[PDB]
Amino acid sequence: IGALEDIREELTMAILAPVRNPDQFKALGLVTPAGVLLAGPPGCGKTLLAKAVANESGLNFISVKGPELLNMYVGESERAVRQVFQRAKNSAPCVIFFDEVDALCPSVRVVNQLLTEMDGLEARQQVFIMAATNRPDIIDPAILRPGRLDKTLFVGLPPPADRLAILKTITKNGTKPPLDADVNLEAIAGDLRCDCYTGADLSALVREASICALRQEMLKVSHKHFEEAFKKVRSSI
Protein backbone atom coordinates (compact mmCIF):
# COMPACT_ATOMS: atom_id res chain seq x y z
CA ILE A 1 0.00 0.00 0.00
CA GLY A 2 1.05 3.62 -0.75
CA ALA A 3 -1.13 6.58 -1.84
CA LEU A 4 -4.42 4.52 -1.64
CA GLU A 5 -4.04 4.04 2.14
CA ASP A 6 -3.30 7.81 2.57
CA ILE A 7 -6.35 8.94 0.46
CA ARG A 8 -8.50 6.35 2.38
CA GLU A 9 -7.59 7.84 5.81
CA GLU A 10 -8.19 11.45 4.69
CA LEU A 11 -11.71 10.65 3.50
CA THR A 12 -12.74 8.68 6.63
CA MET A 13 -11.55 11.59 8.87
CA ALA A 14 -13.71 14.11 6.96
CA ILE A 15 -16.85 12.20 5.94
CA LEU A 16 -17.13 9.12 8.28
CA ALA A 17 -15.38 9.87 11.65
CA PRO A 18 -16.92 13.44 12.16
CA VAL A 19 -20.51 12.20 11.46
CA ARG A 20 -20.11 8.86 13.33
CA ASN A 21 -18.29 10.36 16.43
CA PRO A 22 -19.25 14.12 16.58
CA ASP A 23 -18.63 14.67 20.29
CA GLN A 24 -15.26 12.84 20.14
CA PHE A 25 -14.22 14.68 16.88
CA LYS A 26 -15.22 18.20 18.14
CA ALA A 27 -13.63 17.47 21.61
CA LEU A 28 -10.13 16.86 20.06
CA GLY A 29 -10.48 20.29 18.30
CA LEU A 30 -10.61 18.64 14.84
CA VAL A 31 -12.13 20.63 11.94
CA THR A 32 -12.70 19.02 8.55
CA PRO A 33 -10.60 20.61 5.77
CA ALA A 34 -12.42 21.44 2.49
CA GLY A 35 -10.21 18.84 0.73
CA VAL A 36 -6.79 17.35 -0.14
CA LEU A 37 -4.30 17.99 -2.92
CA LEU A 38 -3.02 15.08 -4.99
CA ALA A 39 0.46 15.82 -6.39
CA GLY A 40 2.71 13.91 -8.78
CA PRO A 41 3.41 13.33 -12.51
CA PRO A 42 0.34 12.63 -14.74
CA GLY A 43 -0.68 9.00 -15.32
CA CYS A 44 -0.02 7.90 -11.72
CA GLY A 45 -3.73 7.29 -10.98
CA LYS A 46 -4.81 10.37 -8.93
CA THR A 47 -8.35 10.19 -10.47
CA LEU A 48 -8.66 6.33 -10.18
CA LEU A 49 -7.52 6.20 -6.50
CA ALA A 50 -9.95 9.07 -5.68
CA LYS A 51 -12.79 7.09 -7.36
CA ALA A 52 -11.57 3.86 -5.66
CA VAL A 53 -11.73 5.34 -2.10
CA ALA A 54 -15.19 6.94 -2.77
CA ASN A 55 -16.56 3.61 -4.04
CA GLU A 56 -15.34 1.31 -1.19
CA SER A 57 -16.81 3.93 1.32
CA GLY A 58 -20.20 4.05 -0.57
CA LEU A 59 -19.73 7.74 -1.53
CA ASN A 60 -20.73 9.64 -4.67
CA PHE A 61 -18.16 11.15 -7.03
CA ILE A 62 -18.49 14.39 -9.07
CA SER A 63 -15.61 15.42 -11.40
CA VAL A 64 -14.56 18.89 -12.70
CA LYS A 65 -11.89 19.39 -15.32
CA GLY A 66 -9.71 22.49 -14.76
CA PRO A 67 -9.38 23.66 -18.42
CA GLU A 68 -13.01 22.56 -19.29
CA LEU A 69 -14.41 25.00 -16.66
CA LEU A 70 -13.10 27.94 -18.81
CA ASN A 71 -16.38 27.60 -20.89
CA MET A 72 -17.45 31.27 -20.32
CA TYR A 73 -14.50 33.50 -19.39
CA VAL A 74 -15.36 34.83 -15.83
CA GLY A 75 -19.11 34.23 -16.59
CA GLU A 76 -20.68 30.71 -16.42
CA SER A 77 -17.40 29.46 -14.79
CA GLU A 78 -18.34 30.92 -11.33
CA ARG A 79 -21.96 29.69 -11.76
CA ALA A 80 -20.60 26.15 -12.56
CA VAL A 81 -18.29 26.31 -9.45
CA ARG A 82 -21.45 27.19 -7.41
CA GLN A 83 -23.48 24.37 -9.11
CA VAL A 84 -20.84 21.61 -8.48
CA PHE A 85 -20.77 22.48 -4.75
CA GLN A 86 -24.62 22.58 -4.78
CA ARG A 87 -24.86 19.21 -6.70
CA ALA A 88 -22.46 17.60 -4.16
CA LYS A 89 -24.61 18.78 -1.15
CA ASN A 90 -27.84 17.27 -2.66
CA SER A 91 -25.90 13.95 -3.34
CA ALA A 92 -23.99 13.85 0.02
CA PRO A 93 -21.76 11.96 0.99
CA CYS A 94 -20.07 13.07 -2.26
CA VAL A 95 -16.48 13.82 -3.40
CA ILE A 96 -15.86 16.86 -5.65
CA PHE A 97 -12.73 16.14 -7.82
CA PHE A 98 -10.96 19.12 -9.31
CA ASP A 99 -8.83 17.50 -12.00
CA GLU A 100 -5.80 19.63 -13.03
CA VAL A 101 -6.53 22.22 -10.28
CA ASP A 102 -3.30 24.00 -11.44
CA ALA A 103 -3.50 26.69 -14.21
CA LEU A 104 -7.23 27.01 -12.97
CA CYS A 105 -5.59 28.48 -9.81
CA PRO A 106 -2.20 29.80 -11.08
CA SER A 107 -9.69 34.40 -13.52
CA VAL A 108 -8.60 36.27 -10.30
CA ARG A 109 -12.23 35.98 -8.97
CA VAL A 110 -12.88 32.22 -9.58
CA VAL A 111 -10.10 31.62 -7.01
CA ASN A 112 -12.24 33.69 -4.52
CA GLN A 113 -15.42 31.75 -5.52
CA LEU A 114 -13.43 28.50 -5.06
CA LEU A 115 -12.19 29.77 -1.65
CA THR A 116 -15.76 31.03 -0.83
CA GLU A 117 -17.33 27.64 -1.60
CA MET A 118 -14.54 25.78 0.20
CA ASP A 119 -14.91 28.00 3.33
CA GLY A 120 -18.70 27.63 2.94
CA LEU A 121 -18.40 23.83 3.51
CA GLU A 122 -19.20 22.13 6.85
CA ALA A 123 -18.65 18.57 8.12
CA ARG A 124 -22.46 18.14 8.36
CA GLN A 125 -22.68 18.64 4.53
CA GLN A 126 -20.51 15.43 3.94
CA VAL A 127 -18.65 16.93 0.87
CA PHE A 128 -14.87 16.38 0.30
CA ILE A 129 -12.65 18.07 -2.32
CA MET A 130 -9.79 16.21 -4.06
CA ALA A 131 -7.65 18.34 -6.32
CA ALA A 132 -4.89 17.11 -8.69
CA THR A 133 -1.71 18.71 -9.98
CA ASN A 134 1.72 17.81 -11.40
CA ARG A 135 3.21 21.03 -9.99
CA PRO A 136 2.00 22.08 -6.49
CA ASP A 137 4.67 24.86 -6.25
CA ILE A 138 2.76 26.66 -9.09
CA ILE A 139 -0.81 26.59 -7.53
CA ASP A 140 -2.24 29.47 -5.39
CA PRO A 141 -0.95 28.83 -1.77
CA ALA A 142 -4.34 30.33 -0.68
CA ILE A 143 -6.25 27.16 -1.68
CA LEU A 144 -3.58 25.20 0.26
CA ARG A 145 -3.84 27.23 3.56
CA PRO A 146 -5.32 25.32 6.60
CA GLY A 147 -9.06 24.61 6.31
CA ARG A 148 -8.88 24.47 2.47
CA LEU A 149 -6.60 21.96 0.59
CA ASP A 150 -4.18 21.81 3.61
CA LYS A 151 -3.03 18.19 3.32
CA THR A 152 -0.98 17.47 0.16
CA LEU A 153 -0.71 13.80 -0.83
CA PHE A 154 2.10 12.69 -3.17
CA VAL A 155 1.08 10.06 -5.75
CA GLY A 156 3.95 8.12 -7.28
CA LEU A 157 4.25 4.51 -8.53
CA PRO A 158 1.31 2.49 -7.11
CA PRO A 159 2.36 -0.45 -4.81
CA PRO A 160 0.51 -3.88 -5.29
CA ALA A 161 -2.44 -2.94 -3.00
CA ASP A 162 -3.10 0.39 -4.92
CA ARG A 163 -3.01 -1.57 -8.24
CA LEU A 164 -5.81 -4.02 -7.16
CA ALA A 165 -7.86 -0.93 -5.97
CA ILE A 166 -7.22 0.80 -9.31
CA LEU A 167 -8.27 -2.44 -11.13
CA LYS A 168 -11.44 -2.90 -8.98
CA THR A 169 -12.43 0.66 -10.13
CA ILE A 170 -11.51 0.46 -13.87
CA THR A 171 -13.40 -2.89 -14.17
CA LYS A 172 -16.06 -1.52 -11.67
CA ASN A 173 -15.45 -4.77 -9.61
CA GLY A 174 -15.50 -7.13 -12.61
CA THR A 175 -18.82 -5.80 -14.01
CA LYS A 176 -17.63 -3.14 -16.56
CA PRO A 177 -15.72 -4.95 -18.16
CA PRO A 178 -17.30 -8.24 -16.97
CA LEU A 179 -14.46 -10.61 -15.96
CA ASP A 180 -14.75 -14.41 -16.01
CA ALA A 181 -13.86 -16.59 -12.94
CA ASP A 182 -10.28 -17.43 -14.24
CA VAL A 183 -9.39 -13.70 -13.89
CA ASN A 184 -7.99 -12.90 -10.40
CA LEU A 185 -7.20 -9.12 -10.26
CA GLU A 186 -5.16 -9.79 -7.08
CA ALA A 187 -2.80 -11.99 -9.25
CA ILE A 188 -2.68 -9.34 -12.06
CA ALA A 189 -1.83 -6.55 -9.48
CA GLY A 190 0.99 -8.63 -7.98
CA ASP A 191 2.48 -9.62 -11.42
CA LEU A 192 6.22 -9.07 -12.20
CA ARG A 193 5.75 -6.56 -15.10
CA CYS A 194 3.21 -4.52 -12.93
CA ASP A 195 5.87 -3.51 -10.36
CA CYS A 196 7.03 -0.62 -12.64
CA TYR A 197 3.41 0.23 -13.71
CA THR A 198 1.81 3.70 -13.42
CA GLY A 199 -2.00 4.22 -13.09
CA ALA A 200 -2.08 4.66 -16.92
CA ASP A 201 -0.43 1.28 -17.67
CA LEU A 202 -3.02 -0.39 -15.36
CA SER A 203 -5.69 1.66 -17.21
CA ALA A 204 -4.14 0.50 -20.58
CA LEU A 205 -3.88 -3.14 -19.35
CA VAL A 206 -7.69 -3.29 -18.85
CA ARG A 207 -8.39 -1.42 -22.17
CA GLU A 208 -6.06 -3.77 -24.20
CA ALA A 209 -7.60 -6.91 -22.55
CA SER A 210 -11.13 -5.46 -23.26
CA ILE A 211 -10.00 -4.58 -26.87
CA CYS A 212 -8.87 -8.23 -27.30
CA ALA A 213 -12.29 -9.41 -25.99
CA LEU A 214 -14.13 -7.07 -28.46
CA ARG A 215 -11.72 -7.96 -31.37
CA GLN A 216 -12.31 -11.79 -31.00
CA GLU A 217 -16.19 -11.35 -30.97
CA MET A 218 -15.92 -9.47 -34.35
CA LEU A 219 -19.14 -10.78 -23.59
CA LYS A 220 -16.42 -11.38 -20.88
CA VAL A 221 -12.65 -10.61 -20.36
CA SER A 222 -10.46 -13.75 -19.92
CA HIS A 223 -6.93 -14.36 -18.47
CA LYS A 224 -5.89 -15.05 -22.09
CA HIS A 225 -6.88 -11.39 -22.91
CA PHE A 226 -4.86 -10.02 -19.98
CA GLU A 227 -1.92 -12.22 -21.10
CA GLU A 228 -2.11 -10.81 -24.68
CA ALA A 229 -2.72 -7.28 -23.21
CA PHE A 230 0.65 -7.31 -21.31
CA LYS A 231 2.27 -7.88 -24.76
CA LYS A 232 0.30 -4.75 -25.98
CA VAL A 233 0.75 -2.25 -23.07
CA ARG A 234 2.07 0.68 -25.20
CA SER A 235 0.69 3.27 -22.70
CA SER A 236 2.17 6.79 -22.99
CA ILE A 237 3.38 6.28 -19.31
Question: φ, ψ for residue 198 (rounded to 5)?
Answer: -95, 180
- Give the resolution to one decimal, in Å: 2.6
Name the domain boundary from 157, 181, 211: 157
Residues 141 and 187 in one domain: no
Residues 3 and 76 in one domain: yes
169 marked as part of a ligand binding site: no
190 marked as part of a ligand binding site: no
75 marked as part of a ligand binding site: no
93 marked as part of a ligand binding site: no
32 marked as part of a ligand binding site: no
Name the domain boundary from 138, 157, 176: 157
Beta-carbon count within 10 A of 118 CB: 21
Nearest to 85 by CA among 61, 54, 117: 117
Residues 102 and 185 in one domain: no
Range of the domain at 233: 158-237
CA distances from 216 to 115, 199, 210, 213, 219 (A): 51, 26, 10, 6, 10
Experimental approach was: X-ray
Structural domain count, the chain: 2
Instruction: Kindly report the CATH number assigned to the domain that includes residue 26.
Output: 3.40.50.300
Residues 202 and 149 in one domain: no
Q: Which residues contact 21 (CB under 8 A, 6 or more apart)?
A: none
Locate the DSSP E strands across 40-138. Answer: 60-65, 94-99, 127-133
Name the domain boundary from 106, 131, 157: 157
156 marked as part of a ligand binding site: no
Residues 5 and 80 in one domain: yes
